[PDB]
């Protein structure tokens, strides 16, 4: 019985920690040079935030970020990891001669014991669309170990939302679902399921990158301040929007990306997953509208993106939007945990 | 609770039925024309095995195989399905005006109650490498409903294994593993994890197709007779082999494929996933040796492939092989549940 277990269906947790138990998965994240290189730079260039300090690494995986904290001179790093990756992290701490400075604690950060409070918490808890995984709440939970006035790296996260037009992506959903619109598939009329097939595809956020020319308005930003936020703040995330359209066309949905900032004593370093920046393993995420909206340049597209946390380590997404000048409206429900990994 | 839940981790079962509850997944199987067309032919060309008979469809999915039994004149078909796909199958039965003949029964075949015994059981229970999923055991379990001298479609299954040489595949996997050979990844020594990393990558069976020129010896065949086997026969599957090498070179592992036969009263119909036959959504499956074996034409490669059923709806594979002429041995352990889907 913990904060984690009460928040999470055991079946989801098992699958989740199995996934991170593979060295190939740790390797996928490590190999993202923009990510891993930026974390390293953020920590090393802010060396005074680490020199002789006590550090907590929330979800250490291979231990990579803890090693950077050590390169920056930290005195003691508690590296907490809930998957079977904890044993491999331990092998690396030993082989890198760091047993006196990095202590791997196997288990959930919501369940383990730390022997002292820490000066700074480091973590990479970001899912696709930022919020997938609900590991941001683990990272916030971890502040129970933080000395008053302690820091967190990353310090803040921004999600960006912007409307897009992408007629080809939109038409691809019907193309796929029209498999079911056959009156005699081997003698069987499949047609009655075509609607259900359309709904299935539209419920999947599309994880992939895209050309910035699809974007039809300046993005709106929603910020989580990790120093100030409480876990409960991530249970219901309401993002209102009021887009002033830069281009006329059919709006087929909303595009999402995120940035995080490491606000150190020496400098602020940003890690961005924006479509204007080099590609990362996070890509970007698009949520389609099953009913597209016509807008002309100068119109306002208003509505809300509401994310409601669920016990499958993710969110139910509800996007409602309207063009203010016409009143035409579109309402959409998506299951963040089960997206379309279109980049594959 | 049931035979099923006793042998199945809940976390595995949830993920498994979630996978099959997607229309897109049913479509993937349905669209395999060799598979679906062969099933239809097996059923329709053996019409006297269905005409005025009672049928059980184990894991009906969309209902496709039940429609084929109805086409062949079956009096009653019980279509059992444990995923949420059952609700879509009922929609199709109504829209195809077959409410009087196809009765969908939601639930596990191990847990439902059927109104009567059946003349014939149809299913498509084959996983990749035949044995993945442990659905063969559900199919065998279902014989509790089979009338004396009832039939099974498919009736028998043959797994084939043959040694192969494929330096490119071996090096592709080896190269991924050797990320963990780096002594200074961002200044961190990962090398102590090299052995673990090689073990992990080589533990993954490789699902994809290949040119038959890679095969180094005639296949060994192991047959499961579905009419005769008991579910317990599938807990421990031991396949000895003695290959008479036809070509000299490095044996990089064993290649696997399978055929099933529908042995009806009118004719036998074969469905094959062999690499000498048109490609199916099953592809083929290769288990690599991390330590390849050198063999000369005329040598014998002998050993055992042992499959031990596990609670994750799959098998722990051990392959021990040796070149008899030199005493060169290779021992390997593979996790069938977690393969490398190389064909993507
Ligand atoms: C704490 N966050 C750590 C971050 O570095 C993870 O960043 C990402 C970035 C992009 C993605 Cl697409 C993922 C990310 N997430 C999750 C995930 C997780 C975790 N929890 O729920 C879900 C869903 C999953 C499952 C995931 N992948 C499944 C995947 C794509 C489809 N596959 C495939 O085509 O193989 C044939 C199998 C491998 C990659 N990727 C993670
Ligand atoms: C009862 N057996 C029904 C048969 O029709 C299933 O036949 C196959 C044939 C080949 C594959 Cl490679 C699979 C088969 N199996 C299992 C499976 C299952 C089920 N239980 O444990 C496992 C593992 C899984 C997960 C699975 N896929 C994951 C996958 C990776 C590649 N994909 C992709 O790139 O785009 C989505 C699609 C999703 C394909 N495919 C099934
Ligand atoms: N509640 C929790 N407690 C402990 N570890 C957790 C956790 N939730 C997620 N994790 C772990 O956090 C890691 C996130 S992936 C990032 C790993 C590593 N810090 C890196 O930057 O490369 C995974 O290894 C996952 O198993
Ligand atoms: N123990 C069990 N009881 C009931 N259904 C099962 C089962 N194990 C697997 N299934 C179902 O069996 C189906 C196998 S896929 C084959 C679907 C369909 N008969 C066709 O040939 O196209 C899946 O839908 C899966 O959910």
Numbering used by the authors:
A (entry chain B), B (entry chain A): 134 to 477
Give the original sentences from the paper that presented this experimental model.
Several rounds of structural refinements that focused on improving ADME parameters led to the synthesis of EZM2302 which was found to be a potent inhibitor in the biochemical assay (IC50 = 6 ± 3 nM, n = 21) and maintained its selectivity profile over other histone methyltransferases. The crystal structure of EZM2302 was solved in CARM1 in complex with SAH and revealed subtle but important changes in the binding mode of the ligand and the protein when compared to earlier compounds. Overall, the position of EZM2302 is shifted 0.4–0.8 Angstroms when compared to compound 2, resulting in an extensive, water mediated hydrogen bond network between the pyrimidine core and the protein (bottom). The addition of the methyl group to the 1-amino-3-phenoxypropan-2-ol moiety alters the vector of the methyl amine which results in a direct hydrogen bond to Glu266 and displacement of a water molecule. The chloro substitution of the benzene ring is accommodated with only minor changes to the protein and π-stacking interactions with Tyr261 and Phe152, and Phe474 are maintained. The dimethylisoxazole moiety makes van der Waals contacts with of the slide chains of Glu192, Tyr261 and Lys470. The spirocyclic moiety makes additional van der Waals interactions with Phe474 while the majority of the substituent is in a solvent exposed region. M, EZM2302 IC50 values varied less than 3-fold. This noncompetitive pattern of inhibition with respect to SAM is consistent with EZM2302 binding the arginine pocket of CARM1. Synergy indicates that these compounds bind different pockets in CARM1, in agreement with the crystal structure. In fact, EZM2302 is only found in CARM1 crystals with SAH.
